[PDB]
Amino acid sequence: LHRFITERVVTVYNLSEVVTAYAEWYNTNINVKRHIALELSQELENSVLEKYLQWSPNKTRILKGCRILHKFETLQPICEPKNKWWEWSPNPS
Amino acid sequence: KSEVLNTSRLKEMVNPGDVTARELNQKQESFQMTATMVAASNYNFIIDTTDHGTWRRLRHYRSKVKFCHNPDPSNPYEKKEDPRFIHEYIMDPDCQNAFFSILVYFWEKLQKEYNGQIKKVFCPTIESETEAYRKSQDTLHRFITERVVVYNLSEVVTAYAEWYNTNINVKRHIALELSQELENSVLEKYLQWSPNKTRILKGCRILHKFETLICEPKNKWWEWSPNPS
Numbered sequence: 539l540h541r542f543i544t545e546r547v548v549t550v551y552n553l554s555e556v557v558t559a560y561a562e563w564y565n566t567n568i569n570v571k572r573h574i575a576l577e578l579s580q581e582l583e584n585s586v587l588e589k590y591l592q593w594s595p596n597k598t599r600i601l602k603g604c605r606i607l608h609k610f611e612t613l614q615p616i617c618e619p620k621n622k623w624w625e626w627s628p629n630p631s
Numbered sequence: 632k633s634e635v636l637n638t639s640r641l642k643e644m645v646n647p648g649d650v651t652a653r654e655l656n657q658k659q660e661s662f663q664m665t666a667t668m669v670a671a672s673n674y675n676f677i678i679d680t681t682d683h684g685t686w687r688r689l690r691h692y693r694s695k696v697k698f699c700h701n702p703d704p705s706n707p708y709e710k711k712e713d714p715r716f717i718h719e720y721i722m723d724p725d726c727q728n729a730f731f732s733i734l735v736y737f738w739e740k741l742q743k744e745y746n747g748q749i750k751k752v753f754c755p756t757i758e759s760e761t762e763a764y765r766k767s768q769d770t771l772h773r774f775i776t777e778r779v780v781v782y783n784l785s786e787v788v789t790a791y792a793e794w795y796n797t798n799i800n801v802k803r804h805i806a807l808e809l810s811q812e813l814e815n816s817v818l819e820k821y822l823q824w825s826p827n828k829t830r831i832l833k834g835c836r837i838l839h840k841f842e843t844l845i846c847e848p849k850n851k852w853w854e855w856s857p858n859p860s
């Protein structure tokens with residue numbers, strides 16, 4: 539999740555397209571797996587998105603600062619003992 | 632992760648019903664089942680039902696604490712975790728005896744106060760957070776409030792299916808039940824009865840991207856508090 543965050547993102551873009559984008563990114567970058575969008579919302583609130591956190595008129599806590607990407611668009615904004623280590627060394631060891 | 636309950640294997644369990652299960656090849660005596668049930672998780676419980684039969688034998692609550700070894704102050708919902716409640720404090724006989732005493736005392740209190748009826752006892756935090764969860768987990772209302780403010784009915788069910796998969800998760804639905812719940816939902820001011828013998832709605836908008844329109848004890852809460860408690 540954080541790899542996708544600080545790999546593809548640097549309007550509010552809603553959130554369904556966001557979850558689908560993360561799903562396809564994970565399928566391509568990592569493995570083909572289905573993600574339940576509610577979970578992705580919870581970890582998105584848990585991830586670094588509070589600065590982008592916003593609200594929608596349809597009663598939807600929404601995001602901001604969104605950078606869309608679907609192709610090659612790129613960025614588009616200690617020590618050692620003498621001879622006895624088993625001697626346990628001093629208290630710091 | 633979060634899983635759905637599918638409303639099977641639940642009402643039967645919630646109700647104390649005797650059952651001649653087990654002994655598939657043979658036959659195990661019908662045994663009466665009577666056990667208090669508790670379900671907790673770090674994730675969400677997906678529910679898929681609307682019948683009064685369901686949503687009536689259920690109770691919901693949400694915790695408001697968290698224990699950690701770095702107890703940052705200024706947050707009342709955070710305390711220094713004790714890495715000792717688990718590795719010990721369980722095998723000690725005396726603590727178990729004390730807990731058993733607490734349980735028997737509470738059962739005696741319940742029996743002498745509410746005559747054994749757990750439904751009659753009143754908790755405002757409960758039966759309010761529960762109906763708050765009821766306001767959720769009912770995705771049809773969310774779809775209606777998100778996408779619609781005659782288009783027939785196949786379009787409606789397909790729109791609900793695509794919305795659900797996108798908003799929640801790719802899941803399969805049946806058009807008939809969705810329609811009947813639509814006449815069971817807040818659509819009757821729009822829903823009508825066409826002369827072509829096809830129940831349809833009216834004033835239907837299909838949005839695509841953005842189309843606009845109590846008390847505290849002295850020091851002993853186990854004193855049962857006053858009668859309202």
Ligand SMILES: Nc1ncnc2c1ncn2[C@@H]1O[C@H](COP(=O)(O)OP(=O)(O)NP(=O)(O)O)[C@@H](O)[C@H]1O
Binds near residue numbers: 710711712713714715
């Ligand atoms: N009232 C309390 N005072 C102090 N420590 C507590 C208290 N209640 C719980 N703890 C500690 O906080 C932790 C409770 O977390 P807990 O819910 O058991 O974790 P979990 O996610 O369920 N799985 P696990 O971390 O293995 O226990 C344990 O380490 C307890 O010892």
